[PDB]
């Protein structure tokens, strides 16, 4: 054993590194039991540093995985905190979104308080109400439906008076 | 297989399970999530099975049967081809043929 | 000669700690051929566990980065599967939802 009580054993090639300070516990334990090969660093820090820049591209650190980029094909994940987030097909069982930018929704139902187009608005009370040429609108709600003009002058009213 | 590879500053993962993620940036191709909590979201398609909204600013709708133009013409196929078509100038009802039998507003 | 391990040939130092066990290969490869230096760890099991509690915060399993908690600044994902997401601005080409519940929703 040319190692310091880690060498390699038969039945596990335990490079331990097991660097034991104050009763911290570091170490680099490569086992391999033969059925599961662990590289177990214990570290407060482990680190990948590019051989290039000495940037620390990865570093897990009090229980953090710390990464400049990541390329992941899968990823199941408890809980996620993105600043920023592209996705090219999402598949989402609930959602809360406080402001979003749909360029084509569609959806089998749509609960909603207020809606607005450009020229239009169906508001928390059920009032739809349409603009139209010159300034008239269309106002209508479960009671009527009324016509105004331009002017604001109400020309027809369907419904409650 | 090298299912973990850091390489050129970034940790190539084939799978990988995180119970508590921070990210800066996201690149997802695709993306289950079971409880999203978006402050802002741009989308290109959606498809939405139980939309809820306390306001929905929209250029134009669509139903089976109905649309709302970007313009504001509110307008609903009826039985046999019918139609109302809406606007806040008017109400026309159209019947199966295309032809105007009621108008309501502006003529 | 490095029994517990190691080769500095002219062309490539292998740090290759080679744990061949029941051949598995288990090895911490450090690779350095004076272009691309490769640390190439072969196990079932990378674990980072932390030096002060024994827990493993990262678990390499299995083909399986098992991480308790990640920052990562720069992420491309093929298929996440979250269970719950807290995102501040997302750019989503497409999307299917099966409940949404959105304070303002502008859409073309």
Redesign the interface.
Known sequence: ???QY???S??????GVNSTVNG?????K???????????????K?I?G??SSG?T??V?E???????????????????????????????????????????????????????????RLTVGGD???????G???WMNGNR?D?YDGSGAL??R?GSW
């Open positions: 054993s040319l190692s880690m060498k390699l038969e039945y596990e090639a335990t490079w911290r516990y570091a170490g680099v490569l086992t391999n039991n033969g059925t599961n090969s662990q590289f177990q660093v214990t570290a407060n482990f990948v590019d051989g940037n591209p990865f897990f009090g229980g953090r995985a710390r990464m400049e980029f990541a390329d992941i094909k899968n990823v199941n994940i408890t809980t996620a905190q993105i600043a920023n987030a592209r996705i090219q097909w999402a598949q989402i069982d609930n959602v809360s979104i406080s402001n979003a930018q749909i360029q084509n929704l569609s959806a089998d139902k749509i609960t909603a308080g207020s809606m607005w187009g450009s020229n239009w739809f109400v349409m603009g139209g040429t010159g008239a609108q269309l439906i016509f020309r027809i369907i």
